[PDB]
Structure 1
Amino acid sequence: STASALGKLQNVVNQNAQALNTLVKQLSSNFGAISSVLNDILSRLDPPE
């Protein structure tokens, strides 16, 4: 009947899932470059920059 008695295992699962999800999410950042996708940078500039 009573739930929330298994906090530790659920916490471990949530931590792993959140870490993996944010690692995946980081791909969309810019890091100060012109764009966040390689193809746009390649297909809009000569290699010097």
Structure 2
Amino acid sequence: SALGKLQDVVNQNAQALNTLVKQLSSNFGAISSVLNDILSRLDPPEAEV
């Protein structure tokens, strides 16, 4: 734990990237989190929503 300050900065940046990548898996109230599924399943009036 001598070099904890640099490892702390690296871990914080990597964790922020991992959270940002993980946020794509959430649908945020939509039917699916995948854009291709929505574009292949729905007409543009509801796919727009």
- TM-score after normalising by structure 1: 0.81
Q: Hey, what's the Cα distance between the residues in 2 that align with 1:13 and 1:45?
A: 42
How many corresponding residue pairs? 45
1:31, CA displacement in angstroms? 0.4
Measured against aligned partners, the alpha-carbon deviations of 1:17-42 in whole angstroms (never above 9, x if no partner) come to 11111111111101000111111111
Structure of higher CA gyration radius: 1
Gap runs ≥5 in structure 1: none
TM-score, reference length from structure 2 = 0.81
Identity of aligned residues (%): 98
Q: Which has the higher helix share?
A: 2
Q: Stretches of 4+ moved more than 3 A in 1?
A: none
Structure 2: where are the runs of 5+ without partners? none
Tell me how large the CA RMSD over aligned residues is.
0.8
